[PDB]
Amino acid sequence: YDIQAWKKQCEELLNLIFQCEDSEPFRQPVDLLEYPDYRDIIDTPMDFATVRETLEAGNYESPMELCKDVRLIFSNSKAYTPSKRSRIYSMSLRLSAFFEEHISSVLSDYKSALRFHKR
Ligand SMILES: CNC(=O)c1scc2c1OCCO2
Numbered sequence: 001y002d003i004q005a006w007k008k009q010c011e012e013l014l015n016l017i018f019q020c021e022d023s024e025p026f027r028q029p030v031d032l033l034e035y036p037d038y039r040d041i042i043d044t045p046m047d048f049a050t051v052r053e054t055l056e057a058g059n060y061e062s063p064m065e066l067c068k069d070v071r072l073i074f075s076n077s078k079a080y081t082p083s084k085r086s087r088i089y090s091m092s093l094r095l096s097a098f099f100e101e102h103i104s105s106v107l108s109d110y111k112s113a114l115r116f117h118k119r
Pocket of ligand 1: 030035076077080081086087089
């Protein structure tokens with residue numbers, strides 16, 4: 001019932017994601033010189049370095065906020081791809097399945113801790 005435990009658990013999960021080859025296209029902001037139409041399609045850019053920096057600055061109040069920003073990385077990939085068979089889109093679908101498998105317990109444990117605090 002530790003209400004603060006989610007933060008280290010999210011740092012550890014981000015470390016795993018940065019070690020995965022599938023994260024390489026998503027580690028820094030999309031290069032607008034390589035993709036000059038990107039901002040015509042995508043309203044709010046997001047990347048894993050921006051997520052890690054926001055966490056380490058103390059600017060997430062909950063793991064649900066972190067999870068909304070990671071899911072925006074994946075929805076931006078789905079919106080920008082020209083094909084459901086593209087290389088980079090393929091990489092985002094595998095990384096999303098890995099992220100969702102690992103974040104589920106983080107969210108469950110945090111919500112349980114809050115309910116115990118309010119009991
Ligand atoms: C050649 N580019 C692509 O097929 C795709 S699919 C998703 C993307 C991306 O390039 C930029 C990053 O996000």
